[PDB]
Each structure stands twice: as C-alpha cells, then as structure tokens.
Curated annotation (Swiss-Prot), chain A:
Subunit structure of this chain's protein: Component of the 19S proteasome regulatory particle complex. The 26S proteasome consists of a 20S core particle (CP) and two 19S regulatory subunits (RP). The regulatory particle is made of a lid composed of 9 subunits, a base containing 6 ATPases including PSMC3 and few additional components. Interacts with PAAF1. (Microbial infection) Interacts with HIV-1 Tat.
Species this chain originates from: Homo sapiens
Protein name, as recorded: 26S proteasome regulatory subunit 6A
Molecular-function GO terms, alphabetical: ATP binding; ATP hydrolysis activity; identical protein binding; proteasome-activating activity
GO biological process entries: blastocyst development; modulation by host of viral transcription; positive regulation of proteasomal protein catabolic process; positive regulation of transcription by RNA polymerase II; proteasome-mediated ubiquitin-dependent protein catabolic process
Binding site for ATP: 37-44
Post-translational modification: Sumoylated by UBE2I in response to MEKK1-mediated stimuli.
Shown segment, full-protein numbering: 191 to 428 of 439
Gene name linked to the record: PSMC3
One cellular component (GO) term of this entry: extracellular region
Curated annotation (Swiss-Prot), chain B:
Induction: Expression is not cell cycle-dependent and occurs throughout the cell cycle.
Entry protein name: 26S proteasome regulatory subunit 7
Entry keyword Repeat: no
The species this protein was found in: Homo sapiens
Residues reported in the UniProt entry to bind ATP: 59-66
PTM annotation, UniProt: Monoubiquitinated by RNF181. Phosphorylated. Dephosphorylated by UBLCP1 which impairs PSMC2 ATPase activity and disrupts 26S proteasome assembly.
UniProtKB/Swiss-Prot annotation, chain C:
Family to which the UniProt record says this protein belongs: Belongs to the AAA ATPase family.
PTM sites of type N6-acetyllysine: 39
Keyword Lipid biosynthesis in annotation: no
Originating gene: PSMC6
Native species: Homo sapiens
Cell compartments where the protein resides: Cytoplasm; Nucleus
Name recorded for this polypeptide: 26S proteasome regulatory subunit 10B
GO cellular component, one term: cytosol
Stretch of the intact protein here: 168 to 383 of 389
Major localization listed first in the record, in broad terms: cytoplasm
Function: Component of the 26S proteasome, a multiprotein complex involved in the ATP-dependent degradation of ubiquitinated proteins. This complex plays a key role in the maintenance of protein homeostasis by removing misfolded or damaged proteins, which could impair cellular functions, and by removing proteins whose functions are no longer required. Therefore, the proteasome participates in numerous cellular processes, including cell cycle progression, apoptosis, or DNA damage repair.
Length: 238, 255, 209
C-alpha cells in the first residue's frame, strides 16, 4: 500500500488520462508488470490489498479458476475476461503462480501445463496479435524464478519485471509497516528479532503470525500488541 | 419449505462442555474461536486486524458428533445454523447454489448468523459445489467473520494443497482416546436414565482401555438396548456386564 | 507454402515474424506450438485436415509457427505423423496458392533434421548478419513520429543493438521514448538513452533464453 503506489497508480492511470501526451509524443505506455522474486513478500494478499486501494473495478482470477475439467473452456474464460474487461468498465485482474504453469518439457506426450500454455499462449496470442492494447492490461506474478517463460518479452506482455529480493530487515519492515500501519503498535517493537525470525514465511503465513500475535493478547492483559508476541507467534506456528 | 430448511435450524441443546478430557489443547483452540470472538467483539476489533476465523478437524473419528454438540450447547443462547454434508451430493444437481445462497440469506435475516458444515467427506457437479462453495465462504458477500470450521472424518483433498494457505489455517487433529478422559463422557451419560450411583464411573472407565467416544457410545447404547431388552427397572452393570465386555471386546477385535 | 529463416548465432526470429507481421500482415490466422500436446491416444490427423480444411475454406490464412525447439521412445513418432500430414497437405491436390506458414525456433542444434529435408522446409536461409542495412532502413523509416534531441546518430544506436532484429531496435528506441515520457520532456540528454540501450538491450541479451 506504501512501497508500491507510483508504478501501480501511474501505470493504471496514464493509459486513460495521459492520452494527450500520447498524441503529442507518439509513445505507448507499458502494459505488463511482473512482481516476481523469492517468497516472503506476500504479493497475493498485498497486491490484492492494493487492488482495492486503486479504487477502480476489480475481478478475481485465480489458478483453479481458468483450469476446468472440460476442454475449450480456457478460451471461453479468456474471451469472457475480455468481454467484461475489454467490453465493460475497466477492471483490474491480478493472477499469481505463473511460473508453475510455464513449464516447457521436451517430451510432448503427457503435460497439462502445456494446455495451460495453450490457454496462456492463446492470451499472448490475443495480446501480441491484437495491437490496440490501450484498454485493460494483464498483470501476472510468480513466486520463483526456476522456470521462467522466455516468450514474455514484449511491451504488451510482462515487460516491467520488477525484482523483489528476500524480505530483509528493510523490506520486512516495509511490508510489515504496511501490514501494521493502522493497528495498535506499541512504541517498543524494534522489529529486529521478529523481522529476522521471519524466514521462509509468505505474506499469508506472516499474516497468520499476526493473527497468532492477536490470539494471546487477550490473556496477556495488555490491550496493545507487544514486541515479543510476534516472535511468540513465529515460534508458535513453527 | 423443504425438510432441509425446517431441520437445518438446531434446537434441543445436546452434549455440553462437561466432557472436557484428553485432547484439551485443540478443543480450547477451537473453543476460543466459536466462543470468544462473538462474546467479546470490542477488544478483538480494537486488538488489531481481525479475530481468528476458524480451525480444521480431520483424521480419526474418535469422539465425533460430540464436540460440535459441545459447540451447540456452549452457545451464548443465540443458536447458529449448521449444514450436513449429505445435502451437498444428491440427485438433481444445481440446487446446491440456491441452497448455499438461501442459507446465507437466512444468515442475513438472523443478523450474520454462524454457518457450519458438518461431515464434508460426503465430476463437474462436485467442482461447482466446491469452487462455488469457496466463492461463497471465502467470498466477502455474505460475511467474512461468522464461522468457518470443517469437522469431519475424511478431508477429501481436492485442492487444499494450494487453497489451504490463506483465510483458513490451524491444521490440527480431532481428538484422541485416553484412559482418564472417558469418565467425563460417563459423567454426561449420567444425565440419561437414572443409573444407580453406587457403581463407580472409574470402575467402568478403567476396564475399557483405548476406547474412543464411539466405542463407549456403543457401550451406553448397546447397554441401553440390552437393558430395555432384559425387562428390568434399574440399570446395574451386574446384569449387562456381558453386554459391556462383549461390546468392547467383540468390537475391539476389529476396531 | 513454407520458408525457414534460422540464425545460428542469437535468437529472436519470432520477433522477426512480429516484424513482418507488424509491417504488413493483412491475414490473421495464428497457430501456437502448444496445441500438439497429444496427451490422448493420438488423432492429430483429423486436427490437421480439420484446421487446414478451415484454411481451405478461409481465404485469409498466414501462419507463424514459433517455439518449435522444445517440441522437437515415441517422442519423434508423433513428429513423423504430423510431418507426414504436412506432406499430405502440400504434396497432394491442395490449393498451395492460398496457404502460407513460417516456422521459427531458438537453437541451431534443434533445427529438426527431419524438417531439414526438402519438400518440408524448401527455402532455408542462414542469418549470420541481421541485415544491418535493412535495420538502418527500418530505423530511418520508423524514427519519424518519435521526437528526440537534435544531436542524434543512427549508426551508433544500430551498432550498439544488434543480433535480434531491427524491429527490436525499434523497441529500444521506443523504449527510450517510454523513459523520456516518464521524464516528462520531449528532448533530453542521451545519457538515459544509452541507459535504455545498455540496460534494456543487455536485459534482452540476458533474458533472451
């Protein structure tokens, strides 16, 4: 909500408001942004937490949503998302876990991920093949850089690949002050030990750590969350 | 009004908290989520982000249909709405969405009533009910703070490997049988037909080691069937002792 | 009915199909390499006669096959089947004047020696030099609407960005314009232009797998 508002808000407002500069300069805006990197940032709950902060329309689109038991439904959901998004009011679409479906095996005999690459590369067909992409874009993100799709190098495709490293004390302090920017924070949380113990913990698991900190705070007697309760929640879940 | 609507409302307060024994840690971890968030709503809103959503109860049956009964009895006198899993998989599919939306509408009529799904362990006809069931429980349309708990025997893991890291958490077990825990279930079976209090409960509880809640429920059930069969007036273990050791040993052979 | 444009050094010929397709295409019919999964028993014959039968029924048909390296034991038997269907498609009594396709790949060792046989890929031209004069031409006739500083050199930007395509160089210059529009100015110092050429072009060289 705090450490990413310029690329987001500018990247969603400029293709509709800055059209005058687009006609005066002849420059198209970027379309795809990739919020990749090692886990621990919480791109799902924090990116979705920022989609409501965009104040625009939002439409959910997850992994098991596109993948159906029947065949041919992937194109139906792609053209449906282009009906509501491309035809209806401008909505925001944020997908996640794109690297797990970007596998390119050598043996073409049994792989569902390549049919997910038929729907996915069909969307890339409807983005590279369709030049007028000034309307609703496509936003994707991955939790690992093990198998990166090499065919994502285009302005309409995922171009602005913003790398987010391991959530160090500075980064964990940023996303944790975004996650704890409104709640009752006592003036004694140094965030040093508890931000150091947050290893291999995604933003959802760190939110669960915040809940577990929100559990014993009734029997501790203090109505405000303390410093040691975070690491107590870490050592409580694992 | 279908039978599921008139039967869906829970009444007749069943087994109470007096059966606290054995698995006390997890029953507290699931009691502080059904009792505390509704009884003390102000210090959970002022305490931080949101109160705990719920837990999960899978694994062995053990003392099933007794802990949800405990959650019904220990209610704050505002009875909640529970759903059985047998209504999900039935003939003439498609009505599951109208049902799962009409019970949420009844929850809106009942000032955000708590919704519980019992025995979830009961293929597009299922994919629509589980994907739309996630789109309704995990959706913010009805409510996101009422109740989420799946107490069942089998998890039927279709997409929990990636749908577990989120609003649902606290992977724990259901219960486990102990030696000294059964005397509380006997103490709540004292609330049944008047049994002669001269028979010590520990004497009946120490002669059935490693007996789950269903096995002792079959003790106080088959002992009742063979008690009314004997055509007597009062229940004494000197008469149906063969029913007791027969029902714990003949059933202990395979279970 | 088919042409092969492979380059042993470098990759990015799919962006060349996007250069010809972005210059003059006029016929939209795309086929992706992810439609030959063949997870079933195998019936690609009716898919070839059906889709190419629709290519017979439809006059606008220009195909661009890309990313064929990863799809090239019975791993090769399906390739011999679909290839025998290709021979069935441009060796029978077929309307060859209406069909048009282009195959692309990424490596010079996975060039499908079965496809290297004539009849399948007739016209094959190795690209050892990415047409520096056609690249300079594409920059001269694509550098019109983009406004830059007065002091500008074309041969320097051509020489610093090579190996992929001239339309990719157009993407480098329009990328420098996409940064100049972020710096809310029409003409700026060429330092940021060299940062877009070095960082963006070298980022393409790094992530061009």
């Amino acid at each position: 909500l705090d450490k990413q508002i310029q690329e987001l808000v500018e990247a969603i407002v400029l293709p509709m408001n800055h059209k005058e500069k687009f006609e005066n300069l002849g420059i198209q805006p970027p379309k795809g942004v990739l919020m990749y990197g090692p886990p621990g940032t919480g791109k799902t709950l924090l990116a979705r937490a920022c989609a409501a902060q965009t104040k625009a329309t939002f439409l959910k689109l997850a992994g098991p949503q596109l993948v159906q038991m029947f065949i041919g439904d992937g194109a139906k959901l792609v053209r449906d998302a282009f009906a509501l998004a491309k035809e209806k009011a401008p909505s925001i679409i944020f997908i996640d876990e794109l690297d797990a479906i970007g596998t390119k095996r050598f043996d073409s005999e049994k792989a569902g991920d390549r049919e997910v690459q038929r729907t996915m590369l069909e969307l890339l067909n409807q983005l590279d093949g369709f030049q007028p992409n000034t309307q609703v874009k496509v936003i994707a993100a991955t939790n690992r850089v093990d198998i990166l799709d090499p065919a994502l190098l285009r302005s309409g495709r995922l171009d602005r690949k913003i790398e987010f490293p391991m959530p160090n004390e500075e980064a964990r302090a940023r996303i944790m002050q975004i996650h704890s920017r409104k709640m009752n924070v006592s003036p004694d949380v140094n965030y040093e030990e508890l931000a150091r113990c947050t290893d291999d913990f995604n933003g959802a698991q760190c939110k669960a750590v915040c809940v577990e900190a929100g559990m014993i705070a009734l029997r501790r007697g203090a109505t405000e969350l303390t410093h040691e309760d975070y690491m107590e929640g870490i050592l409580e879940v694992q | 009004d279908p039978t599921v609507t008139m039967m869906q409302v829970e009444e007749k307060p069943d087994v109470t908290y007096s059966d606290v024994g054995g698995c006390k840690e997890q029953i507290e971890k699931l009691r502080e989520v059904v009792e505390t968030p509704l009884l003390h709503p102000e210090r959970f809103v002022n305490l931080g982000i949101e109160p705990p959503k719920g837990v999960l109860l899978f694994g062995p049956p053990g003392t099933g249909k007794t802990l949800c009964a405990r959650a019904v009895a220990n209610r704050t006198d505002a009875c909640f709405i529970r759903v059985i899993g047998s209504e999900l998989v039935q003939k003439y599919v498609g009505e599951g969405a109208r049902m799962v939306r009409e019970l949420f509408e009844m929850a809106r009529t009942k000032k955000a009533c708590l919704i519980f799904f019992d025995e979830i362990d009961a293929d597009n006809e299922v994919q629509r009910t589980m994907l739309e069931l996630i789109n309704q429980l995990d959706g913010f349309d009805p409510r996101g703070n009422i109740k989420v708990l799946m107490a069942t025997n089998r998890p039927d893991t279709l997409d929990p490997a990636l749908m577990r890291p989120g609003r649902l958490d606290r992977k724990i077990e259901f219960s486990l049988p102990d030696l000294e825990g059964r005397t509380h279930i006997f103490k709540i079976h004292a609330r049944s037909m008047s049994v002669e209090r001269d028979i010590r409960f520990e004497l009946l509880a120490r002669l059935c080691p490693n007996s789950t809640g269903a096995e002792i429920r079959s003790v106080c059930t088959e002992a009742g069937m063979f008690a009314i069969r004997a055509r007597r007036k009062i229940a004494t273990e000197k008469d149906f002792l063969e029913a007791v050791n027969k029902v714990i040993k003949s059933y202990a052979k395979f279970s | 009915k088919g042409c092969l444009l492979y380059g042993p050094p470098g990759t990015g010929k799919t962006l060349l199909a996007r250069a010809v397709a972005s210059q003059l295409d006029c016929n939209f019919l795309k086929v992706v390499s992810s439609s030959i999964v063949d997870k079933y028993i195998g019936e690609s014959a009716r898919l070839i006669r059906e889709m190419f039968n629709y290519a017979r029924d439809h006059q606008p048909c220009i195909i661009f096959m890309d990313e064929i390296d990863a799809i090239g034991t019975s791993a090769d038997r399906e390739i011999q089947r679909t290839l025998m269907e290709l021979l069935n498609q441009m060796d029978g009594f077929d309307t060859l004047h209406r069909v048009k396709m282009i195959m692309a790949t990424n490596r010079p060792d996975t060039l499908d020696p079965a496809l290297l046989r004539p009849g399948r890929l007739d016209r094959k031209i190795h690209i050892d030099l990415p047409n520096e004069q056609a690249r300079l031409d594409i920059l001269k006739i694509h550098a019109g609407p983009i406004t830059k500083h007065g002091e500008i050199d074309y041969e320097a930007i051509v020489k610093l960005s090579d190996g992929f395509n001239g339309a990719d160089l157009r993407n480098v210059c329009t990328e420098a314009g996409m940064f100049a529009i972020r710096a809310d100015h029409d003409f700026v110092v060429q330092e940021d232009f060299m940062k877009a050429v070095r960082k963006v072009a070298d980022s393409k060289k790094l992530e061009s797998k």
